[PDB]
């Protein structure tokens, strides 16, 4: 007998990349579902008995150690930000990226990226700290998105940046290379362009964009009081997890009540 | 000469608990400000040279290790949640706590607490994991608040909870005692009551409420599919930091562009 779309969808929820099971081999749905439920319960029990760390939390901690050890100051800045930051970032209020903003009340929004808060920290810290200024942040960011296998509306960004000396393309590429080598992720760099920053160095794993990176200065700097060379890159943590664990859909990696470390919680 | 309110406010921004300086000794504002600016620049330079970890991030990591090591599963659940969770939690839509909710779009809000997402995880995990189920989450929560020295609109909650065996008042108190002993924070337990959960065991450091804790079952359980004994407690991380560092105002501990590890970034 043949599987309905609802049945295939249920088996896909329970399937994991490490499995090799044919869903349409002719084996009945009831046996495929029971087999996968048993494998997933075993996987979750082993997590609970032996590791207990959340993939997103653990990856944030690993990345934090990497950057702290390399001289970058760990920032934790507001997630709920003034709506005025959007227009000030060059997100023209009828850009499709402008349509991606979650508004809160009348004058606030959920940050769609970490850059503006980090630009404010670079400016303020440069009055107190020796050259170069090196900072980074990891945390939640928010964008309205069309349904896709590589986009979440609530995701987790890493942005590291440096201002002052050493803010060259070669140093930016070297940091990205050291970082992704530390995580074991192969990549290439390709040129792209975006509305906020202009030309970017996009960090690609196959056709998947892991990061956009920028070498300043750029015209936007004046609007933020940035008056020195700078470099920076933003990475999505859920995309890194998707690569590391071979997930078919980024939802496996997200903050979710529906998956724990890529395992369905609907068991 | 005498200091204006604006001048005193500026010196208070630059003052730290470890200082002992009289602001109104007669020394001119210019010298008090220069002295404090020099101390704070030194403090920030030492952080940058030697530690580099954010107080909120570091405390989250320390708490995470404590609970993971004691058998609790680390959860990271959505911050942007359905507005329907508010009414379902017994937050009657004309309660003053209901007026504290940040709404997003028409059907979402920023979570004001971690409990609903954790209740969903307890229910789902109980179908797969052995008794007892032990989980915790640390992350941002959001409430509209009147200006006060102990409240932030964007704060960080820890909630740990357990369901099944061992869900007694004595075990809940023992976990709280082990936890606060680990952090070096003295406390007492006093009874209180709240609208969502009913009677609480409030964890007090002097007059400062560090946590509300609850021993279930409670009537709300049925609305969430919870059908076993449970215990749980919610703690504000910024309040823990305020105690640890003797901050006069909780803003020193918050996500902020205005303070880094309690040091003014306006230098
Ligand atoms: N909606 C999203 N969900 C998950 N990760 C995201 C999302 N948007 C951006 N990221 C991650 O943040 C990084 C930096 O953000 P950036 O603004 O460059 O994204 P982007 O160019 O809009 O990505 P895409 O072109 O894939 O939409 C991206 O390279 C990606 O890893
Ligand atoms: N606005 C806030 N800012 C900082 N921490 C908070 C805030 N609201 C709650 N917390 C922390 O979260 C814990 C659990 O939340 P709970 O709902 O019990 O707070 P609460 O009883 O409303 O606190 P309070 O009575 O001080 O307003 C509190 O004990 C406190 O440590
Ligand atoms: N999410 C991103 C990833 C690139 C990040 C690059 N920025 C960065 O690393 O932070 C340092 C920095 C410096 C200057 C600015 C800025 C402004 F505030 F306007 F944004 N121009 N002045 C901002 C951030 C993207 O959409 O490509
Ligand atoms: N912030 C809090 C701090 C007390 C937390 C206690 N809860 C907890 O630890 O999580 C476990 C849990 C179990 C059952 C429920 C629930 C519901 F979903 F409705 F909320 N009743 N079913 C919810 C959480 C407070 O305002 O007192
Ligand atoms: K496979
Ligand atoms: K690599
Ligand atoms: K003092
Ligand atoms: K104690
Ligand atoms: Mg995009
Ligand atoms: Mg892109
Ligand atoms: Mg990009
Ligand atoms: Mg309150
Ligand atoms: Mg209270
Ligand atoms: Mg309370």
């Amino acid at each position: 007998p043949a599987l309905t779309k609802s049945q295939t969808d249920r088996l896909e929820v329970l399937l994991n990349p490490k499995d090799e099971i044919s869903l349409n081999s002719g084996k009945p749905f009831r046996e495929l579902e029971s087999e996968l439920l048993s494998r997933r319960k075993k996987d979750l029990q082993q997590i609970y008995a032996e590791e207990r760390e959340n993939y997103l939390g653990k990856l944030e901690r690993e990345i934090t150690r990497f950057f702290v050890d390399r001289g970058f100051l760990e920032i934790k800045s507001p997630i709920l930000i003034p709506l005025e930051y959007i227009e000030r970032m060059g997100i023209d209020n009828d850009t499709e990226l402008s349509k991606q903003i979650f508004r809160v009340d009348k004058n606030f929004c959920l940050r769609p990226m970490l850059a503006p808060n980090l630009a404010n920290y670079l400016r303020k810290l440069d009055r107190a700290l020796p050259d170069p200024i090196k900072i980074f942040e990891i945390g939640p960011c928010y964008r309205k998105e069309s349904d896709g296998k590589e986009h979440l509306e609530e995701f987790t960004m890493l942005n590291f940046c440096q201002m002052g000396s050493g803010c060259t393309r070669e140093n930016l590429e070297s940091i990205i290379t050291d970082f992704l080598n530390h995580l074991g992720i192969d990549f290439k760099i390709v040129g792209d362009s975006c509305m906020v920053f202009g030309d970017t160095l996009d960090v690609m794993h196959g056709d998947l964009e892991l990061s956009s990176a920028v070498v300043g200065p750029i015209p936007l700097d004046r609007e933020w009081g940035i008056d020195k060379p700078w470099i920076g890159a933003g990475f999505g943590l859920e995309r890194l997890l998707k690569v590391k664990h071979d997930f078919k859909n980024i939802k496996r990696a997200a903050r979710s009540g529906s998956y724990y470390n890529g395992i369905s919680t609907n068991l």
Side-chain angles (χ1 to χ4, degrees), chain A:
Chain A
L3 298 189
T4 65
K5 168 61 165 168
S6 181
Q7 286 173 330
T8 292
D9 280 357
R10 171 59 171 162
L11 298 181
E12 289 285 349
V13 163
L14 297 169
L15 193 68
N16 269 33
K18 57 161 180 173
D19 298 326
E20 187 179 277
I21 302 184
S22 183
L23 299 190
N24 303 289
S25 64
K27 198 166 166 63
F29 173 73
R30 62 185 178 277
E31 293 183 350
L32 294 161
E33 192 189 30
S34 178
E35 172 68 28
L36 290 174
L37 284 163
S38 293
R39 293 180 186 195
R40 298 298 86 82
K41 284 186 180 183
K42 174 191 179 299
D43 290 346
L44 207 52
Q45 285 155 12
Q46 180 77 351
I47 283 168
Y48 190 47
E50 290 177 358
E51 295 286 324
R52 290 178 298 279
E53 296 181 72
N54 178 265
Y55 279 175
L56 261 176
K58 186 172 69 178
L59 180 57
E60 169 177 337
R61 296 186 287 277
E62 179 182 18
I63 297 176
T64 295
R65 183 197 250 188
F66 178 90
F67 282 99
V68 166
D69 285 352
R70 275 146 194 82
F72 292 73
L73 189 64
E74 178 194 12
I75 305 298
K76 293 289 190 193
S77 72
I79 299 162
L80 181 60
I81 63 162
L83 187 61
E84 184 270 332
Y85 285 11
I86 301 303
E87 43 156 46
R88 189 130 67 85
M89 289 282 301
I91 304 177
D92 299 308
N93 67 351
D94 285 311
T95 290
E96 311 78 36
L97 160 64
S98 183
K99 278 86 91 182
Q100 297 188 268
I101 301 304
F102 285 97
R103 290 186 64 179
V104 182
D105 298 337
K106 302 182 177 179
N107 300 95
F108 303 100
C109 64
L110 300 176
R111 66 188 180 184
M113 64 184 61
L114 303 176
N117 287 349
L118 294 175
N120 287 331
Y121 259 105
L122 288 175
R123 181 185 70 249
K124 291 174 180 298
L125 292 170
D126 197 43
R127 280 62 179 163
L129 295 186
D131 164 72
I133 309 299
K134 301 203 293 185
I135 69 178
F136 75 102
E137 178 164 12
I138 300 163
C141 288
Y142 294 87
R143 295 180 190 192
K144 295 175 181 181
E145 301 275 1
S146 304
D147 305 11
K149 297 183 183 67
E150 305 162 359
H151 290 88
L152 298 164
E153 296 200 315
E154 169 178 57
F155 67 101
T156 309
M157 188 80 86
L158 156 70
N159 184 132
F160 58 91
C161 55
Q162 177 166 325
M163 182 175 75
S165 63
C167 294
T168 59
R169 181 183 58 96
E170 61 263 28
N171 190 32
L172 179 54
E173 297 194 11
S174 177
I175 298 161
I176 291 166
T177 299
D178 290 353
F179 175 55
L180 295 179
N181 286 352
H182 183 72
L183 301 182
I185 295 173
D186 299 331
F187 69 102
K188 57 179 177 178
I189 298 183
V190 313
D192 210 321
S193 64
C194 70
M195 294 180 15
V196 170
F197 297 109
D199 291 338
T200 63
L201 299 171
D202 274 22
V203 180
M204 304 299 296
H205 179 83
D207 291 333
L208 181 64
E209 174 193 331
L210 302 183
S211 170
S212 286
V214 181
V215 180
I218 61 176
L220 197 47
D221 291 349
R222 193 172 176 269
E223 199 44 56
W224 292 82
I226 295 295
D227 58 1
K228 287 183 178 181
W230 65 269
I231 53 170
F235 280 80
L237 271 69
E238 296 85 358
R239 288 190 181 175
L240 295 171
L241 287 172
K242 180 178 194 298
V243 174
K244 181 179 177 183
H245 297 289
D246 294 307
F247 294 147
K248 290 194 214 174
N249 196 314
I250 197 171
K251 301 187 151 309
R252 294 290 178 115
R255 286 178 183 265
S256 177
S258 296
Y259 296 92
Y260 187 82
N261 290 5
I263 297 160
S264 178
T265 58
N266 289 115
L267 301 180

